[PDB]
């Protein structure tokens with residue numbers, strides 16, 4: 001069952017933006033969103049693709065473990081945190097595109113395409129350059145499709161090893177306190193219109209898990225913090241987090 005709650009639109013309208021939040025109550029097997037149409041519209045995954053990409057790289061041995069160091073190639077890029085060595089944890093934390101571009105090149109088109117089909121991931125379409133198709137190629141995924149994929153990951157039901165899934169879930173760790181744990185991944189798609197921000201993941205509670213996937217129009221990088229801020233406002237409203 002799916003329930004549309006247009007009152008959440010206020011959280012976007014209050015910030016002069018437009019977007020969708022999708023929530024899934026795992027215990028009750030019920031979904032909620034402010035906009036059923038946009039919840040099923042497919043966008044470039046951008047850096048949210050680092051979840052499947054990490055899973056594939058680990059399962060194929062491209063990445064040995066979460067400690068393996070991926071040395072900076074010495075080319076200065078405009079994101080300072082990218083101009084440094086990384087492991088899987090920090091590369092995910094700082095959305096380090098060039099590290100993941102190298103993963104994708106080593107994975108190769110054929111294994112990447114097969115694995116995305118095995119994951120049932122979005123439109124499963126890698127057309128474009130193997131090292132950038134999630135930024136400007138043919139792959140597309142909706143917020144509801146993000147939740148389906150994340151639910152499989154949470155339950156270790158993706159067609160990769162349990163180890164690979166545990167490591168990626170560790171790398172997704174974003175926030176943790178005495179009340180909840182958030183494992184999630186941000187995304188920012190700019191190369192094809194409309195420019196959007198993503199935040200996808202889930203909130204672990206003592207007795208339930210709430211999956212979430214949001215995207216929102218992002219004409220400038222100034223609004224990027226709204227991805228988390230809007231999502232948390234919905235979570236607060238629904239009494240999922242304090």
Ligand SMILES: *C(=O)[C@H]([C@@H](C)O)[C@H]1CC(SCCNC=N)=C(C(=O)O)N1
Nearest residue numbers: 046047048095097186187188189224
């Ligand atoms: C992921 O979606 C992007 C993309 C560049 O891979 C990274 C970058 C950022 S913020 C910097 C945006 N400008 C890049 N030239 C994020 C993010 O989600 O904050 N992810």
